[PDB]
Amino acid sequence: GKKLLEAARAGRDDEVRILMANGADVNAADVVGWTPLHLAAYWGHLEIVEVLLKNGADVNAYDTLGSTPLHLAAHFGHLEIVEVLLKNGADVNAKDDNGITPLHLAANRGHLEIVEVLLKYGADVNAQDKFGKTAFDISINNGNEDLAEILQ
Amino acid sequence: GSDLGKKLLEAARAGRDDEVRILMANGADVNAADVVGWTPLHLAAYWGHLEIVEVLLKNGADVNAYDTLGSTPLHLAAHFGHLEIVEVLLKNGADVNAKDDNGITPLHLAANRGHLEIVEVLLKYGADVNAQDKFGKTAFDISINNGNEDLAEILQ
Amino acid sequence: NKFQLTPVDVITAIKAQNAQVAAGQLGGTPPVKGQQLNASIIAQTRLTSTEEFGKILLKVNQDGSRVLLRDVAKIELGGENYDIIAEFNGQPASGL
Amino acid sequence: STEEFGKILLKVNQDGSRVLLRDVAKIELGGENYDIIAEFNGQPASGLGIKLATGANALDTAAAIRAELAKMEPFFPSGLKIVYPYDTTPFVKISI
Amino acid sequence: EDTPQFKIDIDQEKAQALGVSINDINTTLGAAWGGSYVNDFIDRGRVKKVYVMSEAKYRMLPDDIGDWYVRAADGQMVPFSAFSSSRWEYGSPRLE
Amino acid sequence: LGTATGFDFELIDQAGLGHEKLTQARNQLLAEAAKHPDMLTSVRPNGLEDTPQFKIDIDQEKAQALGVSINDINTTLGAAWGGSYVNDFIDRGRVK
Amino acid sequence: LPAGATQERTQKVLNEVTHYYLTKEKNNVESVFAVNGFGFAGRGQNTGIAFVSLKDWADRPGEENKVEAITMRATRAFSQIKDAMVFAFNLPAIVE
Amino acid sequence: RYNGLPSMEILGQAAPGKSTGEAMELMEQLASKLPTGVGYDWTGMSYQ
Amino acid sequence: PGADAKTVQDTVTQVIEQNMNGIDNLMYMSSNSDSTGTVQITLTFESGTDADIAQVQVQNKLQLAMPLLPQEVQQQGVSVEKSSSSFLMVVGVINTDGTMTQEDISDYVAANMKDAISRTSGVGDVQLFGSQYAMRIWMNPNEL
Amino acid sequence: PGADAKTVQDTVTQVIEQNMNGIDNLMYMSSNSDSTGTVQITLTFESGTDADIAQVQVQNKLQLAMPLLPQEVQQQGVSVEKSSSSFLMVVGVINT
């Protein structure tokens, strides 16, 4: 499974293939709680995210700070991966230890397409973080008008 | 002041036993003092010259001389850990409870530097364990502040 | 003036909010033996864009209203100084 | 000394009790850093890794280093000993 | 290769609301987890450094962050957890 | 060239012995030299002997109880008794 | 070792390296001076270096007992160390 | 201080009819009997 | 102290590098900024370049950057050295009575041996394999 | 200004001395720290050393030690000069 965490990070589709077909834990977690899915989501490896989920990867796995792969994908603007994760039952309103949601993150980075998908899947627009901020609050603060209008 | 007085102040400080010997034979002023009011006995006590301390006392030195800030040779001996000098001074009438201008006693000074044997000698000669300096501190207060548990035990 | 602020307040906020902080490490030396994790802690980093400078928070009003730097200033990339302007055959240019 | 640092007075409480540095910290002589730890043949050691200044003579410099080390040895604490784990210069002298 | 690092965001607005200075926040964080060279002292006749830093056991775990308190203007002690949020990310341990 | 006949010797504290012990060893050396008039003449220190100095202790507790800062105390003392270079002015076209 | 690796893990790998020279190269190796936390990087929790001194050429007769064959055998044995890059090598005539 | 360590400089000369080398050799002899941790060096005209 | 690699680069390395110009005989320049809080900048010169002048010219430019560096960096001491990259030798120090720990010996070496060696002509750079003692104040957040 | 010998030695002289490394052709170094608030450190070089190069190397190591010195010493400045004892002449100026 240590082989899997690494292969997942490097986006070695073929290698994930084996290890997979040799029964490596698909939900293997590293020192910070990241699974192979967190890693593929972060580094933008769509094909590996797909395989992983097809092999029973916990889609709502969370790291030691309560963050899920959907958080990572939404934050780093991986639209494809966001769609795939949601289609596989990713909790759209997942909150990390800070009360931060994938919607908060996408909104912060101004990822418009992604923000729309999340909403599509029923992301709660009024969800507040620990500081009581909504994605709307964020869009306003960043002076992002195209985004603020949507959150409406 | 006198020339022999100056020579005695210097010999006492440097621990030149023999020169002191000769100076005593020639009547060098044992009560000479420099600008800060230190006598040959102050110097000998500070620098730890035991034999000179004893010679000076035999030649009529003032055991309780005080400098311009009110400090005595017992203060000095106690502060710098000269145990046998401390004992000799006390044997010769040194004021065990002498306060300098700051209200500091020889006991305060020995406690401050953690000189356990000197502390015991001072208590043996009647040192006042409850004496307070100008800030209201006792030897015990000093011991705890320094975190000296052995000393704190003794002063209980 | 409207917000009861000065350039002193602007300068103070920029220093506080455009900052690059040495924040140390988790599991750094000397560690508790048996420690498995060693990671840098990343706190504030320098701002990188006019957008980021514009949302520097100068103060919030009693009614929770926020005064952002962009509310008292125009924010833009522009020359460190504006004293030198060259032309090549009458056309805007730079040079060395 | 650690004793002196320990009694640094941080504050006096409302009731006149004292808060000393030693009340909020452990106080000890310890390295500026704790990153570098050496062993010689498996035992505790320290050492100096020396690099030659540009253009300097390797053999002359090594002789001056040894001459300086020899001035230090007689004042070592008991048991302290210089060892010679790595030297590029003997090969030069011997091969010549 | 890049490695996991711990990203902490100080919330400016919350800090302002609670009256905690950014300088106190950054010094507390940095001194505790990174260490701080304060000034010099004399060790057996030689000038050497004085360092303040958290004892090892309080700077090993992410959860330890919220055990550090800063004093606000109104004299109240406020935990890091009240004005910050954190997340894991990747970054470089060595930039060429 | 000093004297053709003269020598220039340095006594050295090799082990953090401190000023007083160095002084004692110096004196021990000078006393022995003085017993060889047949070989050594005018063996003497080049420098200065210790002198009385006025040691003043600031009571931190009392300062804190009175609300007097150590910094005001120490600059008041140093500026008054030792003098303090404040800044520069211009006296007939020359900075002083 | 990979960045993120601990000083304790680096020590374990260094112990293996030292052990190898002390037991499998008894006839060739005079001493090993190993340093945890320093490499040509330099500093880091995840790096180390061992300086190795060989017995005199006269006691090392034969190709198999010269540096090239020793370093080659060593690297080969060390290749079977998990999660670390460890290799012995002879310096060139002129690195430059 | 001398070469970075606390020090005290001592001047003197060879007695009449005596070489400075001889005087220096004695000083070294005497210096060898001083308390533990006390060393010495020659500087200036003597260094040469 | 306590800086991550990007903080070192963006607050120290870039600043010094931007001041490195008008230096004679420079072939190239390279640098590492790391999460130990350390920067090393190496300037390599044409064969035959007088190293004394190269060092003087580098430092004249460095001193223009110095005031722009964080106070904590200036206080650690920045250094400019002219030495080979490889070690000439390693002088090791042990205690045969086993009566001094690794930390004790390192402090002894740092405090009593290192400076005189570092001052010796021909010695371009000295690395201590260990660390000099400091007074360590180890804070406890609970008590604070 | 106003410093006693020990204050000068322990905040100025030792710090400067500790930084007099990597300078070519040094024979020895000596210093006096005195109660007039003054320090002089003299570095003497091998005969044949280029005096200008010796001086610039010294000045350059000092420059890098300046941030370690007390503020009031940085304010007075630290002079680095070629040492000479011969005067061509002394012109006195008096008022009669």
Ligand SMILES: CCCCCCCCCCCCO[C@@H]1O[C@H](CO)[C@@H](O[C@H]2O[C@H](CO)[C@@H](O)[C@H](O)[C@H]2O)[C@H](O)[C@H]1O
């Ligand atoms: C027919 C005559 C042959 C020899 C004549 C000698 C003439 C002058 C020689 C002087 C210069 C060096 O001479 C030579 O140096 C080397 C280096 O230490 C030594 O040669 C070496 O012996 C063994 C093996 O050969 C080495 O492992 C060792 O390192 C070294 O001692 C020799 O013992 C010495 O004789």
